[PDB]
Write a protein that binds this ligand. Structure first.
Ligand SMILES: *[C@@H]1O[C@H](CO)[C@@H](O)[C@H](O)[C@H]1NC(C)=O
Ligand SMILES: *[C@@H]1O[C@H](CO)[C@@H](O)[C@H](O)[C@H]1NC(C)=O
Lengths: 105, 99
């Protein structure tokens, strides 16, 4: 259904045949980054729910794979499985908990 | 020596044409495809080739079939050893059987 990530297609008539107009999605401008498979915070290993961990040089963010919008690493978008001594390449970063400041009032 | 079959075919007017793409160009295409799918994942088949670590691509490929990605990261040596043994058995299968 065309080259790229398929969105739609529009059929067209032709003499002794048919003509398709495939509409596709093509990524255009990429930039390079530093990544890690998981985050060790407070003795627990954090893996992303959907997306990927990226680093801009100083901080660590979470973003989706096919597009670049950065978000803060949060308990909502991560899940915990095991301790940070088995995963190869794990780094250290804090994890924001939204429940604590809503508790503290 | 003696008369070959192919010489008789050539003398009777039958000629075999050579292919347009040589074996070296086919091997170059195969090596380019292998390098692309090893380094860039599936992103080289939909535009620009975007690099990624191979363990993280493996985590995505486990995520696509319904298994969570923490299964791979806790067992990565076992998947590596199983893949090495599986690709090593193809060598012993192809070195003996000619069918
Ligand atoms: C990112 O860094 C790599 C490694 O030096 C380099 O080859 C590449 O051109 C850089 N830029 C992008 C957009 O990938
Ligand atoms: C992350 O923190 C732990 C303990 O806080 C420490 O042992 C480990 O070395 C740190 N990671 C790095 C890459 O320094």
């Amino acid at each position: 259904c065309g080259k790229g990530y398929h969105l739609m297609s529009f059929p067209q008539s032709a003499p002794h045949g048919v003509v398709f107009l495939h509409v596709t999605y093509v990524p255009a401008q990429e930039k390079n980054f530093t990544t890690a498979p998981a985050i060790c915070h407070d003795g627990k290993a954090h893996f992303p729910r959907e997306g990927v961990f990226v680093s801009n040089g100083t901080h660590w963010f979470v973003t989706q794979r096919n597009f670049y919008e950065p978000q803060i690493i949060t308990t909502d978008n991560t899940f915990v499985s095991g301790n940070c001594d088995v995963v190869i390449g794990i780094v250290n970063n804090t994890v924001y908990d939204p429940l604590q400041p809503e508790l503290d009032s | 020596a003696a008369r070959d079959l192919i010489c008789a075919q050539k003398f009777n007017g039958l000629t075999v044409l050579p292919p347009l793409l040589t074996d070296e160009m086919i091997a170059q295409y195969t090596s380019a495809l292998l390098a692309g799918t090893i380094t860039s994942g599936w992103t080289f088949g939909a535009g620009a080739a975007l690099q990624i670590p191979f363990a993280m691509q493996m985590a995505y490929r486990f995520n696509g079939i319904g298994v969570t990605q923490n299964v791979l990261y806790e067992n990565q040596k076992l998947i590596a050893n199983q893949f090495n043994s599986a690709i090593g058995k193809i060598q012993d299968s192809l070195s003996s059987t000619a069918s």
